[PDB]
Amino acid sequence: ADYQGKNVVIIGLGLTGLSCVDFFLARGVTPRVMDTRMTPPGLDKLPEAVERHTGSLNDEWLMAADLIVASPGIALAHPSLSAAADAGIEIVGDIELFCREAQAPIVAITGSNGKSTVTTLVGEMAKAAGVNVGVGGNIGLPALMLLDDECELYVLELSSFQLETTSSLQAVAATILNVTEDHMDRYPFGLQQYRAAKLRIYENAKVCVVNADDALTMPIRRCVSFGVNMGDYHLNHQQGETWLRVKGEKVLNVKEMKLSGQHNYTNALAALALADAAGLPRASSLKALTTFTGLPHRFEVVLEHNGVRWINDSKATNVGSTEAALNGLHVDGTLHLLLGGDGKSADFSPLARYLNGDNVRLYCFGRDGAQLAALRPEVAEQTETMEQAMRLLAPRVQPGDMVLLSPACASLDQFKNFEQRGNEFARLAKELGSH
Ligand SMILES: O=C(O)CC[C@H](NC(=O)c1cccc(CNc2ccc(/C=C3\SC(=S)NC3=O)cc2)c1)C(=O)O
Numbered sequence: 001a002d003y004q005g006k007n008v009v010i011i012g013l014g015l016t017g018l019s020c021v022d023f024f025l026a027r028g029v030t031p032r033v034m035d036t037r038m039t040p041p042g043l044d045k046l047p048e049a050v051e052r053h054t055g056s057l058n059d060e061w062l063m064a065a066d067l068i069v070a071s072p073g074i075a076l077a078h079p080s081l082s083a084a085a086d087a088g089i090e091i092v093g094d095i096e097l098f099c100r101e102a103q104a105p106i107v108a109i110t111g112s113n114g115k116s117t118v119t120t121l122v123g124e125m126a127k128a129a130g131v132n133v134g135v136g137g138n139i140g141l142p143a144l145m146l147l148d149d150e151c152e153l154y155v156l157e158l159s160s161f162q163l164e165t166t167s168s169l170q171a172v173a174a175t176i177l178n179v180t181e182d183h184m185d186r187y188p189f190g191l192q193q194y195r196a197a198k199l200r201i202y203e204n205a206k207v208c209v210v211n212a213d214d215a216l217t218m219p220i221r222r223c224v225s226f227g228v229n230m231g232d233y234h235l236n237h238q239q240g241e242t243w244l245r246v247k248g249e250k251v252l253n254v255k256e257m258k259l260s261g262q263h264n265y266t267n268a269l270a271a272l273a274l275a276d277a278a279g280l281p282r283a284s285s286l287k288a289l290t291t292f293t294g295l296p297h298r299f300e301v302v303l304e305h306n307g308v309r310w311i312n313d314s315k316a317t318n319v320g321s322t323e324a325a326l327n328g329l330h331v332d333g334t335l336h337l338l339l340g341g342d343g344k345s346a347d348f349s350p351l352a353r354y355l356n357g358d359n360v361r362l363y364c365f366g367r368d369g370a371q372l373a374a375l376r377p378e379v380a381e382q383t384e385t386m387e388q389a390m391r392l393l394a395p396r397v398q399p400g401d402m403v404l405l406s407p408a409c410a411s412l413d414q415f416k417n418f419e420q421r422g423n424e425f426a427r428l429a430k431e432l433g434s435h
Pocket residue numbers: 011012013014034035036037071072073074161317409410411412416417418419
């Protein structure tokens with residue numbers, strides 16, 4: 001691409017916005033930056049020579065632009081951005097910029113749940129083969145910070161939002177792991193609009209990897225598949241033990257994995273399918289499956305003490321992710337379940353079927369706390385904050401109980417991000433969980 005002499009406007013700062021600023025400056029192009037926030041993250045790191053406008057979008061700048069680079073955090077439907085599109089002004093995001101430059105194959109991974117785990121796993125498979133791999137996108141480094149001539153493979157986690165502004169991805173292997181209701185606050189044509197954004201990942205992909213158990217992951221019109229009882233990559237249960245299989249052949253007894261649970265085994269299948277399609281040696285890929293320990297904030301045991309397990313699943317920001325934590329969950333005593341935050345207009349009702357019996361208590365907080373308590377009012381308490389909920393539940397915890405933060409919501413109403421929410425949970429668990 002040639003950006004010389006263009007008027008470029010970057011919308012949205014933060015680390016990813018800053019990576020866009022740096023990308024253009026290194027090519028001798030001075031962009032301008034706007035953000036609807038008054039003091040957005042990274043403002044103090046923006047070089048003084050870069051003009052910026054904050055607290056609103058600037059239509060004089062947008063309508064003057066030759067190229068608009070939109071954060072995934074700003075709606076394409078924002079009237080100002082919609083006006084620019086109507087005027088034929090080109091709008092891309094950071095992932096589009098990256099795709100135009102990248103000089104190694106790209107494995108591209110999206111989905112409502114699983115996408116960070118599978119991205120990280122494929123990265124570990126590549127490391128085990130001695131491949132120089134750049135892993136990031138929607139996690140770790142923004143993609144533009146991974147760009148390096150010595151990189152041999154990129155593995156990118158991509159959101160629905162990033163995909164909406166991307167047109168030049170030609171992935172060596174692409175997947176949608178699953179599609180369950182999420183981000184409805186940003187998709188006013190509902191589940192099929194959200195799906196359509198994700199379906200973009202398959203365009204011009206060399207190999208598409210689909211979930212045989214989730215029809216929404218399939219192109220609307222020759223994909224490789226993974227699934228539980230069905231698929232090219234699937235599971236084989238053998239009398240109290242489980243195997244990963246590829247086309248009828250056993251490749252791994254899951255007792256060798258550190259991760260456990262069915263959805264982690266289907267994440268492993270998806271990661272192996274992508275790694276195979278990317279040409280990584282099967283042997284090293286299997287070895288990586290045995291060494292991978294999981295991500296922070298993903299069903300993470302932060303304290304096991306005095307007969308009580310305190311579990312940080314703060315990464316559960318939608319109903320499907322909480323369902324995956326609860327489905328088949330074994331607790332000896334009472335589950336004390338923390339739910340709450342910004343539910344993004346989700347329907348919480350699918351959780352209700354997991355919340356029967358005499359051994360469940362709900363502690364509901366944040367913007368949508370009341371809607372969550374309503375799932376089963378008789379065993380529910382509502383508080384403003386997560387800290388209040390923890391201090392309410394802690395005196396009630398008995399040996400054999402589990403305390404589970406799996407909140408089914410975004411954290412952004414009260415926290416910086418789900419990591420901060422998870423870290424605060426862990427600090428409070430350690431305080432409240434020992435004498
Ligand atoms: O709890 C969490 O950590 C976050 C919740 C999570 N995140 C998102 O919904 C999400 C959607 C799009 C993009 C991002 C990360 N990047 C980002 C960039 C800019 C913003 C805010 C902007 S940009 C602009 S201009 N004005 C803004 O307010 C927010 C997030 C996050 C979700 O519930 O899945």
